[PDB]
Design a protein around this ligand. Structure first.
Ligand SMILES: Nc1nc2c(ncn2[C@@H]2O[C@H](COP(=O)(O)OP(=O)(O)O)[C@@H](O)[C@H]2O)c(=O)[nH]1
Ligand SMILES: Nc1nc2c(ncn2[C@@H]2O[C@H](COP(=O)(O)OP(=O)(O)O)[C@@H](O)[C@H]2O)c(=O)[nH]1
Ligand SMILES: [K+]
Ligand SMILES: [K+]
Ligand code: NA
Ligand code: NA
Lengths: 176, 185
């Protein structure tokens, strides 16, 4: 009765769209975001998710676009609603700076596998949102200084965002 | 840097209280709940966390007291506020039916390692709460039918809950009428 629907992106090869089922009742809802048996097989040989992170952001925050050459991510929204965006940031890739966007909320609980070399970003449409992502990497976590950054509104990517004036960090402004 | 403070409980042998650091700014906060390196080492050799669950509950929900002899859990609240309760349900333990309570919210981001053979429960004080817990087990996941349930209001445990009138499932109500039969499989 714990189930996953696992579909590969039609737009970006190697991006996976994972949808869990849920048990809903008078108290709320219960669901499984991840099992090693269901999801780690999607990663390359020798790699498993080993790191769980939470981001709680206020309305009209954008975070991104962030990535590095080794870190795989599995991302969703576990409270509120986001626009989740994946960008192919591999400079050798024929689909370099193509993107895909997912509107994620409790009724659309897509979970996105973001490969290494892809950029990751989200926008908060709700009053606030809690972003959940898992990381898979060998050796050390790649912190912000060693990551690449693209501007949320880079004209090459041309993302359709629901904001014309987001709340950003200095990193994400420097990128613009 | 990503940091953890890890303390064993002073009350219940085997329970760990894990506290992350957070980066806070104008946008909100970022934090790490788990790394294999930091936390999987607290489990038995050969066992790792391999399952992630979310429970979103409305105000005044209780869930519990649920447990099984194989499954280790790592639990916190990632939105809202709960009263998280661990019960030692190991019948051999000197602290059998003793409990520890943690009020968990964004300013008190404790993450509780609940060992196999313990009972797990929580109550939602906020308008709603999102409960996050990881599971570590060999073999198949232990679903509701193969778990034990202790009554939320069992007077041998004597949990100080903030209400006498929580919202409960049929499973958690039925436990209040089967005290003494928690182990029946
Ligand atoms: N789809 C799905 N169903 C689940 C999951 N976890 C539990 N259930 C089902 O949800 C119901 C309640 O399970 P239980 O563990 O009693 O929930 P609790 O009372 O919140 O601990 C049972 O029917 C379970 O089979 C899950 O992760 N996914
Ligand atoms: N304590 C802690 N700091 C973090 C974590 N992740 C990122 N940071 C720090 O938070 C700040 C912003 O990081 P960045 O990756 O730009 O955050 P983003 O803008 O949300 O992607 C940087 O100083 C990071 O070192 C974490 O999990 N825990
Ligand atoms: K793998
Ligand atoms: K271990
Ligand atoms: Na694989
Ligand atoms: Na160990």
């Amino acid at each position: 009765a714990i189930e996953f629907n696992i579909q590969e992106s039609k737009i970006l090869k190697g991006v996976y769209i994972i949808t869990p089922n849920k048990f809903r009742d008078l108290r709320g809802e219960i669901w499984t975001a991840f099992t090693s048996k269901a999801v780690d097989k999607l990663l390359p040989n020798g790699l498993k998710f080993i790191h769980d992170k939470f981001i709680h952001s206020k309305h009209n925050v954008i975070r991104g676009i962030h990535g590095d050459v080794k870190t795989y991510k599995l991302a969703t929204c576990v409270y509120g609603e986001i626009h989740q965006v994946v960008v192919d940031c591999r400079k050798d890739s024929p689909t370099y700076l193509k993107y895909e966007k997912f509107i994620i909320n409790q009724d659309n609980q897509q979970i996105i596998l973001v490969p290494a070399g892809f950029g990751n970003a989200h926008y908060v449409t709700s009053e606030s949102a809690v972003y959940y992502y898992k990381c898979a990497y060998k050796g050390d976590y790649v912190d912000a200084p060693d990551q690449f950054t693209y501007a949320w509104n880079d004209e090459r990517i041309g993302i359709d965002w629901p904001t014309n004036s987001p709340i950003l960090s200095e990193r994400d402004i420097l990128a613009t």
